[PDB]
Each structure stands twice: as C-alpha cells, then as structure tokens.
Amino acid sequence: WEQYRDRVNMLQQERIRDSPLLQAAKENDLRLLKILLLNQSCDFQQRGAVGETALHVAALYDNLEAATLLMEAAPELAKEPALCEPFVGQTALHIAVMNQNLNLVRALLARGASVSARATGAAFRRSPHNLIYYGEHPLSFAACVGSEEIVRLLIEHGADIRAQDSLGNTVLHILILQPNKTFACQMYNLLLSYDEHQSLELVPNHQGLTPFKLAGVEGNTVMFQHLMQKRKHVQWTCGPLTSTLYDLTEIDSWGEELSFLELVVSSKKREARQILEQTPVKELVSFKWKKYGRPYFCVLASLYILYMICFTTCCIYRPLKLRDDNRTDPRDITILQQKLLQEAYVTHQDNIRLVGELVTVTGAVIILLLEIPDIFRVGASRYFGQTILGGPFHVIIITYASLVLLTMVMRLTNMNGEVVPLSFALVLGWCSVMYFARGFQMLGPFTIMIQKMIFGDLMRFCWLMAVVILGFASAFHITFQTEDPNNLGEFSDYPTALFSTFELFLTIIDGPANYSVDLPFMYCITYAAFAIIATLLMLNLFIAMMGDTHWRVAQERDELWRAQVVATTVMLERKMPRFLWPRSGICGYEYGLGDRWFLRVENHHD
Amino acid sequence: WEQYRDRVNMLQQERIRDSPLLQAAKENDLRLLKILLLNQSCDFQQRGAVGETALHVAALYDNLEAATLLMEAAPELAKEPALCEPFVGQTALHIAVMNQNLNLVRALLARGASVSARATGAAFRRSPHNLIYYGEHPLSFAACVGSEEIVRLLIEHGADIRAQDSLGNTVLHILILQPNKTFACQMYNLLLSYDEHQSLELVPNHQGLTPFKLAGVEGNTVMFQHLMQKRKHVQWTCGPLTSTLYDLTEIDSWGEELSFLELVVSSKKREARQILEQTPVKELVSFKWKKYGRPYFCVLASLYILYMICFTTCCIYRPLKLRDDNRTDPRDITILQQKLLQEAYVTHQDNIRLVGELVTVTGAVIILLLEIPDIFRVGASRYFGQTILGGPFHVIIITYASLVLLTMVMRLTNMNGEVVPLSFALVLGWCSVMYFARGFQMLGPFTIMIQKMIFGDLMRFCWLMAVVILGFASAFHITFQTEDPNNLGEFSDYPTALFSTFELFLTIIDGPANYSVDLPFMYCITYAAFAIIATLLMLNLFIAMMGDTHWRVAQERDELWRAQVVATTVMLERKMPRFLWPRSGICGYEYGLGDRWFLRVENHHD
C-alpha cells in the first residue's frame, strides 16, 4: 500500500545493480556497454524487477548515449512496456517524456515507439498514494509536464488527442487537474489549436463530467476564467466602462439532469466555493437569489414557522386526564396521565386539536417525501456531511419526521410514554427553524459558526468535561454515602450525583451548602478543587478557546455562507415547479443569436 | 561567580598598567619597547595578575610588532601558559587564534608554540557564566571562530583532530554547539576532509553523545540536515518527483541502550522539538505512530478506562452499615459508618466487590512497577518537569497508586476515614485518563493548553484571588459576629467565612440575603465592594487574560503536541515486548546493502 511501493523500489534497484547491463546503462559508462554489448552472450531483452528494459533504466537517469547504443544494438527495445503490477504498460517513451529529454524522445520515436501506449499501472492512477497523476498516454504526460515542443512533436508523430484513460479523462481533463497553472492555460490553448475534428470540450468522464464541469468541481478558478474568456463576447466599450455578454450554456445547463452548479456547490474540496465568486457565476446566482431565491425562501420559512406554531399548539393541548390509581408512594408527583384514544376526541376543542394533528402528520410525511429521494439521489455521506447543503439540518429533520410518525403510531396504539418522542420532536423540529437562517446575512454566518463550534470545540470540551464530571461525581457521591440524604438530596446515588456534578460544572445550580448542619470537611476540600479546576479555569478556558477559534475562521464562515446562499438557490428550482422559476438569462432567439440564453454584465474597469 | 571575574579583570588591567613592559606591549609603542628591552635589567619572563606573559598582552590587543620583538628578544615566550584560576592553561596561541590575526599565528608557530595546548581554565568551560564556549585547544578555537586558513595551518603544523577537552567534546561536537551556522557546515565538512584515521564522527562525550545525537539534543536542525545529506542516497528522479533512501543507523539506533529519539524528545531546550519535523525523522515517527503507535495507545486507553470504571464501581459499592451510636448532638447528619473487615465480605456481591478490589490492587502495583523504574532511569526533575513526557500525569499516577495502596492498608488495618484517600484516588485517577488525550488531534493540544494555563495563569490568579478572599472573608466574618448565626449560617466562624467568600468569588452560591430580617449596612457596603472588585473585575479579567494567553501560544502548544506524539511513540517499544513492535524501515540484507535498515521517501519537488 505504501511499504509495497518501497519494497518494489528496492527490488527495482537491486535487479538494476545485480545485472551488469542495467547498472552499466544506469552509470552511462559507454566502453563497458560496448564490451558487454559486442558479445552475443548477453541478453538484450532482459527484464527488471518491474519488467523494465535496460532502455527504461537508460531513460530513467537521462542517459541518452546508453539509450542510443541500446537502440543501435537492438531496434525493437522501444516496443515493450513494463509488465508487472505498479507499471502494467509503462514504456520508455513515458519515462523519456516525463524527464523532458527532447533528443531522447526524438531518437526513441525514430525507431518506432508507440505513441498510443496505454500505461495502466497502479502508479499511474488518480490515487492519494501517488504524488502525481499525469495519465496513461505520453501526450498526457507531455501536457502535464509542461513541454511545448514535445507536445508538437507528439502531434507530428501520430497520437490523436481524443484518447481516454481511466476514469474517462482525456488530456484536457488532466490538464485542468494539475496544479501550477502558469503553463496549463497555454498548453490547453495549444491543444485546442490542434483540435480540428462532437468537439473535444464536450467529451465527458466515466463520471460524466465536462472539462468545464471538472474545472467547476476541482476549483480551478484560473482555468475557469480562462475558459470563460473563450465563452464571452464583449458587446461594447465606451470610455471607462464596458458591457460584455457571457454564455450560460455550460453554466446554467438547462437540458442536463446534473447541472453545473450542483456539481460545483456539493463538492468535497476546500476550494470550488471561490469559483462561485467568478465573473458570470456570482451575478448569475445573485440575480437568481434576489429575483426568486430570497422571497421563496422567506415564504417557506414563514409557512414552516406557522407549521411549527401549529405543532407546538397541538403539543401543548394534549389528551390528559386525572390518574386512576392513587399515589401511596412518597416522592411521586405524577397527578395526570394521558387518556385512551377512544376518549381522546369527544369535544369541539379536541376536534380542533385533531385537525391540527392531521396537519402536522401531513407536514411530516411531505417532509419525508421531499427528503428521502434526496438521500436516494446524492449519496448519504455527502448529503449529511456537507454543512453547505445543511446536512445536520437534514438529519434532524428526518429525525423529527420519524419521531412525529412514531408519536402517531403510539397515539393510535395507545402506548404510554408519548412525552419522550414529543419532547424530542419539539426540540429537533424547532431547532430545524435554524435552516432558514442561511437566507439572511445577519443570521447565516452566526448559525454556521454555531455548527462549527458544535463540531470542533464542543466535543473537545465535552470529552475532558465528562472526565472531570466522572471523577468529581465519584468523589461527591463517595463523600456523602455516610450522610443523611434528607439534608443534601444531591449526591444521593450515582446518577443524581453525576447530574448534579454536571450542573455544578456549568454554574447552573448553587453549591450544596446546608448551614444548619455540619458538612464533611472532605466535601469542602474536593469542592474547592472542583471550583478551582472546573468552575474557574475550564469554563472560562472554553470561552477563551472559542474566542481564539472565532477570530481565526470568520472569513471561512463568511465564504461558507456565501456558498450556502448558492446552495439554497440551486436546492430550489430542482424541487419547485418550473413556472415558479423562469429561465435565467437573456434569450438569444429574440435577437437572432441561436437560443443560447446569454447573460450581460456591465463593468467599470477604469 | 560574576563579580570575581570582574575583580580579576581589574587586577589584570592594573598589573598591565603597573608594569612598563606590559603597558608598552599593550600600547604598541616600538621605541620604548626597544629602550626597555635592550637593557638586561628588565625581566622577560614576567607574570601578570592571571600569570599571563607580555606576549599574551601583545596578542590580546592585535599587537603584531610588539609580539614579534618580544619573540625576537626571547624565543621561549610562546611556551608558557597562564597559570592562575580563570586561565589554567591559556597560551598566547589561543588568544592569537581567537583574534583571527594570521600573521601572528604564523610568527608564533614559527618559534614553536604548542598546538596541543590544553587550556583548562574556568573561562573556557561550558557554563552559563561564560559568553562563549570555544574549547581548550587552538584547533577548536579556530573551528569555532570561523577561519579556514588558520585551521589549515594548524593541521599543517601538528594539531590532531581527535583531541577531547572537558565533557568529552571533540572539535566536531563544539562545532555543532556553536550558533551562527553559516560557516559551521563548511568548517565541519573541511575537518571531515582531513579525517583519514573507529571514525571521528562516532567519538562520544563523557555523557556518551555522538555528534549526530548532540545535534539532536541541541536542536541544530541546519546541522542535522547537513549531516543527513551525507547519510542519504538518492535512488532515482523521474521528472518532477524523486525517490531517495535515508539511513536509519543513527536515527533508529537499534543496538544502543540510549536511543537517538529519547535524547531528542526529552531534552530541556526550547528547540529540538523542531528537529522532529525534519525529512527522515517526521516520516519515521509518522509511520511508527500510524502503524503501531495509535492502535496500541487506544488499546491501552480503553484498558485503563475499563480499569478505572472497575475502580469506580468498587468505590460506589462499599462495606457501609448503620451506625451503632445514636446521634444526641444536633447538626450531625452521619447515619452510616464503614464496617469492619471481618463483616465486610460475606455476600456474593461482596465477593464480586472483592475480586474487583483485587483487580485494582493489581493495577496499582503494576502501575508502580511500570513507573518507579522510570524515576530510577531518567532523573526525577526531568521526568516530572517535562510536559512533553507527561510529567504531571506521572506524579498524579504515582499519587493515585500510593493512595490506592494506602486505602488497601487502611482496609486491612480497619482504620477509619477511608473516604478521604478514596476521594483523592478517584479524582486523581480519573484525571490520569487525560494522559491518553495526547494520542488524538482533537483532545491533545487542548489538554496541554489546560496544563499550560494551570501552571501559568491559574497560579497567578489564585495568589491575588486568595489575597482578596482573605481580606473580604475577614470583613464578612467581622460584620456578622454580633448577629444571629441561625439566619445567615455563612460567615459564622472563620473557616466557613473563608470558604463562603471563596465560593462567592466564583459566583457559585447566591449572595447572602435574608429579606425577612434586617441586615447590617456595612455588609451591604463591603459586599458591593466585593462584587465590584472580585465578582465583576477579577473573574472577567481572568477570562480576558486567558484569552490573551490563548491567542499567543497556540502554535507553541501545536508543536508541543507534535513532539508529544513522538514522545508517546518512543515511550512505547521501550516498555512493550519486541514482538508487538517490529523494526521500522526497509532491511538492507534482502537487497545486498549491508543490514543498515534504510527508509525510502518519495517527494515531489517541482
């Protein structure tokens, strides 16, 4: 996995140094090559540990002289690849192209090396194990390494550009996938110059991604503005300000089931939310959010708040009657019990409760009908793990809907204990109102800052906090086992000791002090220790740690909310009917432009 | 100490200016030297205050002419050192080499100055009193001062390199010990060029440190990477990425009892935890932590958590019975007492408690058998003072094991008062679970941030806080001595007044206010003063001070946790059996490299 690559590397070096031919081709000592090569006892077709030829060893260490006497001795040595596991099809042409030796590429293609060689090795895969991902073809290698004349000479000797390696990538896809974009745009432009017969730009992956859409997913913003340089038309310029006309064919993407914006905003990269601030996309989603996004999000926020008010009002009024059995046990304060279903609804007010119960059951099942096909559409790890798409809000709204239907089953079945799913349903359903805070600048970054602290600082405080609560709760319970529980009812047994220590951690309840009786001195010692450690330091160190966290990632949650507005915009018009959402942009059929649905911007550059 | 060096410096200057010969050699007036030196009444072998010669005075002030007429008048003046306390063996050659005057070194070694002169003075020692530590030999002086030609002329005239001064250092050790490493690597390479017969690089200190290990302890990272340029082999390079093969002979150090990593991570320097981020070491301890470190640490953490759950469960269930004597005294709430040992265990449940007591006694004694030989191995100040090695966790786990054994002695002896060592044992043993938080990125830096604020800000707040508690507790107790204790039981006598003022500092209990009675007005005045000073300012200024501390040293606790993971990794495989921990690296015997156990990395440099 990683020590297997190391093992096969030491085996490769060992079979290089054991063979005199391979080690002599590595050292580039020409006279000893002629001594062992003039004699016919040596084997020219001699393999390495990975099945590599001595020509591969000569191309590995930039040994042009060793390689050209190997080709002069045997001309066929170009036309064998390595045939082992990490290099299933790697030829000497791949090594010569990657090392950027132009004379070696010329002298190796002179004898007839295959330019369509497909190196399906484990090292030439898009994997986290490999440091680079340059392709399976020599032309992809020449485009990724950044050599212009090697690309031109590969076009001159065969090597059609429309060659797809594994995961469906052509050379344009892998040119976008490289970092260090100084030479990527010129290479892309030069292979678009030779692209003369569907075009090469529309060839997808095995995932189905256009190179435009792959640049959208990968966050290659420099390549994105380079691509929209070719997809734009400057209408006019008049002094300091110009008006230009971008094309929304590959951005809006009307006819495709998977659109460009859904692949952009639901990507796992830390980038590709800064590609939503580019020159067509930012004003496109800005017009889409101001014109239709924010009023519709406010409408669904208002009806969800009214639905929560209806659910809360149907929770407050409940079928509760007086209990039948008298309480002969002290410490029991239950005076009411929930009544049976046959006696629950005979009142006009119980019918008013019943129709609202039908409303909240209908709301729960339409929440499930809206949300379970999203779990079946995009994968559940990406659906629930993305804070851009409101993944925690999705899992708590599934939990709320399942708790409401569980409450409905317990209501028809007359099971006891409806207060537990009703209280979980009220807490989670009212906390699901926080999903609609993303539509406002005042509440959005604050809400995802809350979820950021919930994931980051709350857990790392709660583990250490639970350790301190367990230790001091054990001490508090074993300081008062000998004492009377009627004077200090806290720390009576271990669950209420653990809960009381949890409350005393947070300075919620007062310190247990009965001044009319004599308390143990060990309680005072361990409560001074609990006050110094947990009350004084740990709570205020959590305040200081959240301040230190809050000043650092404020820009991150600002741009995360800026992407979250786009996620809200593209979540709508995929669910809502199309007569609520007209097609964004300027229709080109009215002006004789060929129904491409452009978008005009006007910018002041001087 | 330091005013003795000042005193001997003024005595040195006084006996320079009292002597006409020494002051004339200092001022470099040639004719007055010829006048007093042509006459035979003057003494050529005339001492200073430190026993220095006039040749030493001429070499001290760069007086080449005074020194060469002193050597022409008397040729023997090179071959005497100073013979007093701060300079026991300092010659004029040491002063001439330190002042970097090449012509005086040539004219002084022409007359036959000793190149193997060993200056065992108090000024030439590795001490905090001395500003520099350049050695006892002129070759070490020439290497530390940074002169190439003086070094070459010293090797041309005797001066073997394998000369060890005090604390076992050769010239390479003291070349590593210097700061300002611009000329240190070239000097080290130049004396490794002259090293032609064990090699010089393997000569240790009197402490036993190799110069590789001394560079590891001292934190000389530039010298560390310069040393591992010579201990590495580049296997291949193919375009943008290369694969190279570092040697782990002096890094892993299998056969030695003291290994390189233990001397690195348990050093008292503020540096040498940034030497764990170097190219071989970070990859080696990263593989050692992912492959074997983290699963074994998680297994030990889960086993210790289950052991402490067993100790907590054996603490909750206790041999407690009803008390024999009735309580005729009010304010006494003790209703249970611990029973005798002969009546403690007759139940099946008491046997289930007894076997768990045997389990936690076995756990305490194996904690002692694992931890007391560590106190006997490395010194106790370094063992308990290092937050990298978990020193506070070590002293609280010794305290927990001793408290559990004291509880066992009190249980067999039937002493009363087991609740005090049981509660200290529960608090300290559950706080020892915080040791295992260092294996996770989420909990580790937070835990050593807690320890940092405990050492730094908690003490500096608690001294000031205890001052405020003492003053306001004295005022609160002397405001209510005239009043009824049955209405406000707090501030009754001075310990409960001190404790009540302590928990009123922290806003734990409510303010004492009985509205059914008339309180003193002076209590209201001094409680307003206590609320303004302690409640309002001091607590929130402690919050502000910990925020100001927390933003500054966040990267320090990040790199301290990064060293702490390496400390955990090297703490294991020293304690655990060797079949749990196989030898890290790639064995060179399988590939014919001579059993050196290398490690291969592959890096993308372009």
PDB file of C-alpha atoms in Angstrom, chain A residues 485-583:
ATOM      1  CA  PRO A 485     -29.874  12.272  52.126  1.00  0.00           C
ATOM      2  CA  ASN A 486     -32.730  14.336  53.621  1.00  0.00           C
ATOM      3  CA  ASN A 487     -30.383  17.312  54.180  1.00  0.00           C
ATOM      4  CA  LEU A 488     -28.487  17.241  50.861  1.00  0.00           C
ATOM      5  CA  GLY A 489     -30.572  15.328  48.345  1.00  0.00           C
ATOM      6  CA  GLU A 490     -27.951  15.829  45.668  1.00  0.00           C
ATOM      7  CA  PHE A 491     -25.233  13.140  45.502  1.00  0.00           C
ATOM      8  CA  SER A 492     -27.698  10.606  46.938  1.00  0.00           C
ATOM      9  CA  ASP A 493     -26.988   7.862  44.410  1.00  0.00           C
ATOM     10  CA  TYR A 494     -24.681   7.882  41.404  1.00  0.00           C
ATOM     11  CA  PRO A 495     -26.982   9.130  38.544  1.00  0.00           C
ATOM     12  CA  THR A 496     -28.121  12.185  40.520  1.00  0.00           C
ATOM     13  CA  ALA A 497     -24.518  12.692  41.686  1.00  0.00           C
ATOM     14  CA  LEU A 498     -23.366  12.663  38.053  1.00  0.00           C
ATOM     15  CA  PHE A 499     -26.182  15.023  37.026  1.00  0.00           C
ATOM     16  CA  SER A 500     -25.579  17.359  39.991  1.00  0.00           C
ATOM     17  CA  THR A 501     -21.843  17.474  39.227  1.00  0.00           C
ATOM     18  CA  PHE A 502     -22.725  18.223  35.582  1.00  0.00           C
ATOM     19  CA  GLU A 503     -24.891  21.127  36.762  1.00  0.00           C
ATOM     20  CA  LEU A 504     -22.190  22.345  39.174  1.00  0.00           C
ATOM     21  CA  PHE A 505     -19.658  22.310  36.315  1.00  0.00           C
ATOM     22  CA  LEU A 506     -21.713  24.865  34.391  1.00  0.00           C
ATOM     23  CA  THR A 507     -22.568  27.114  37.416  1.00  0.00           C
ATOM     24  CA  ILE A 508     -26.253  26.390  36.860  1.00  0.00           C
ATOM     25  CA  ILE A 509     -27.317  25.407  40.366  1.00  0.00           C
ATOM     26  CA  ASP A 510     -25.940  26.708  43.637  1.00  0.00           C
ATOM     27  CA  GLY A 511     -23.221  24.938  45.576  1.00  0.00           C
ATOM     28  CA  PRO A 512     -24.633  22.403  48.038  1.00  0.00           C
ATOM     29  CA  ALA A 513     -24.380  24.114  51.409  1.00  0.00           C
ATOM     30  CA  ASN A 514     -26.668  23.353  54.351  1.00  0.00           C
ATOM     31  CA  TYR A 515     -25.507  25.739  57.071  1.00  0.00           C
ATOM     32  CA  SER A 516     -27.896  24.304  59.681  1.00  0.00           C
ATOM     33  CA  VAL A 517     -25.927  21.012  59.742  1.00  0.00           C
ATOM     34  CA  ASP A 518     -22.226  20.145  59.897  1.00  0.00           C
ATOM     35  CA  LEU A 519     -20.886  19.206  56.464  1.00  0.00           C
ATOM     36  CA  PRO A 520     -17.856  16.929  55.950  1.00  0.00           C
ATOM     37  CA  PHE A 521     -14.525  18.708  55.537  1.00  0.00           C
ATOM     38  CA  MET A 522     -13.554  16.458  52.620  1.00  0.00           C
ATOM     39  CA  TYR A 523     -16.558  17.815  50.701  1.00  0.00           C
ATOM     40  CA  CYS A 524     -15.155  21.325  51.245  1.00  0.00           C
ATOM     41  CA  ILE A 525     -11.677  20.246  50.059  1.00  0.00           C
ATOM     42  CA  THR A 526     -12.881  18.470  46.915  1.00  0.00           C
ATOM     43  CA  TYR A 527     -15.401  21.236  46.198  1.00  0.00           C
ATOM     44  CA  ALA A 528     -12.591  23.794  46.393  1.00  0.00           C
ATOM     45  CA  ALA A 529     -10.674  21.570  43.952  1.00  0.00           C
ATOM     46  CA  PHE A 530     -13.751  21.324  41.690  1.00  0.00           C
ATOM     47  CA  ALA A 531     -14.239  25.096  41.893  1.00  0.00           C
ATOM     48  CA  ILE A 532     -10.613  25.887  41.021  1.00  0.00           C
ATOM     49  CA  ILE A 533     -10.318  23.314  38.226  1.00  0.00           C
ATOM     50  CA  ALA A 534     -13.748  23.162  36.568  1.00  0.00           C
ATOM     51  CA  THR A 535     -15.655  26.306  37.595  1.00  0.00           C
ATOM     52  CA  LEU A 536     -12.781  28.808  37.485  1.00  0.00           C
ATOM     53  CA  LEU A 537     -10.471  27.564  34.745  1.00  0.00           C
ATOM     54  CA  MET A 538     -12.214  25.107  32.404  1.00  0.00           C
ATOM     55  CA  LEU A 539     -15.397  27.067  31.602  1.00  0.00           C
ATOM     56  CA  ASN A 540     -13.523  30.321  31.031  1.00  0.00           C
ATOM     57  CA  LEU A 541     -10.794  28.466  29.116  1.00  0.00           C
ATOM     58  CA  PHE A 542     -13.607  27.202  26.873  1.00  0.00           C
ATOM     59  CA  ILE A 543     -14.643  30.864  26.455  1.00  0.00           C
ATOM     60  CA  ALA A 544     -11.034  31.776  25.584  1.00  0.00           C
ATOM     61  CA  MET A 545     -10.675  28.823  23.198  1.00  0.00           C
ATOM     62  CA  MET A 546     -13.870  29.735  21.362  1.00  0.00           C
ATOM     63  CA  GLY A 547     -12.642  33.334  21.116  1.00  0.00           C
ATOM     64  CA  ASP A 548      -9.353  32.071  19.658  1.00  0.00           C
ATOM     65  CA  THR A 549     -11.328  29.879  17.248  1.00  0.00           C
ATOM     66  CA  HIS A 550     -13.782  32.682  16.408  1.00  0.00           C
ATOM     67  CA  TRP A 551     -11.202  35.254  15.338  1.00  0.00           C
ATOM     68  CA  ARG A 552      -9.396  32.804  13.020  1.00  0.00           C
ATOM     69  CA  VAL A 553     -12.113  31.246  10.826  1.00  0.00           C
ATOM     70  CA  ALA A 554     -14.504  34.215  10.471  1.00  0.00           C
ATOM     71  CA  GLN A 555     -13.558  34.666   6.800  1.00  0.00           C
ATOM     72  CA  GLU A 556     -14.081  30.920   6.298  1.00  0.00           C
ATOM     73  CA  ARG A 557     -17.657  31.017   7.600  1.00  0.00           C
ATOM     74  CA  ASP A 558     -18.259  34.217   5.597  1.00  0.00           C
ATOM     75  CA  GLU A 559     -17.344  32.494   2.324  1.00  0.00           C
ATOM     76  CA  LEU A 560     -19.119  29.330   3.518  1.00  0.00           C
ATOM     77  CA  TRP A 561     -22.336  31.338   3.929  1.00  0.00           C
ATOM     78  CA  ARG A 562     -21.670  32.900   0.507  1.00  0.00           C
ATOM     79  CA  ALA A 563     -21.575  29.373  -0.943  1.00  0.00           C
ATOM     80  CA  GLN A 564     -24.543  28.371   1.243  1.00  0.00           C
ATOM     81  CA  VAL A 565     -26.756  31.014  -0.397  1.00  0.00           C
ATOM     82  CA  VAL A 566     -25.886  29.473  -3.791  1.00  0.00           C
ATOM     83  CA  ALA A 567     -26.677  26.015  -2.367  1.00  0.00           C
ATOM     84  CA  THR A 568     -30.063  27.348  -1.234  1.00  0.00           C
ATOM     85  CA  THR A 569     -30.603  28.836  -4.703  1.00  0.00           C
ATOM     86  CA  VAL A 570     -29.789  25.586  -6.511  1.00  0.00           C
ATOM     87  CA  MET A 571     -31.739  23.463  -3.995  1.00  0.00           C
ATOM     88  CA  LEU A 572     -34.731  25.423  -5.238  1.00  0.00           C
ATOM     89  CA  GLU A 573     -35.768  25.162  -8.968  1.00  0.00           C
ATOM     90  CA  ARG A 574     -34.835  21.467  -8.691  1.00  0.00           C
ATOM     91  CA  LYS A 575     -37.722  20.783  -6.281  1.00  0.00           C
ATOM     92  CA  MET A 576     -40.166  23.580  -7.096  1.00  0.00           C
ATOM     93  CA  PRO A 577     -42.260  23.614 -10.310  1.00  0.00           C
ATOM     94  CA  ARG A 578     -40.786  25.386 -13.320  1.00  0.00           C
ATOM     95  CA  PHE A 579     -43.480  28.073 -13.547  1.00  0.00           C
ATOM     96  CA  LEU A 580     -42.223  29.476 -10.237  1.00  0.00           C
ATOM     97  CA  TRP A 581     -38.677  29.662 -11.674  1.00  0.00           C
ATOM     98  CA  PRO A 582     -38.365  31.113 -15.193  1.00  0.00           C
ATOM     99  CA  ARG A 583     -35.134  30.507 -17.081  1.00  0.00           C
TER     100      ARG A 583
END
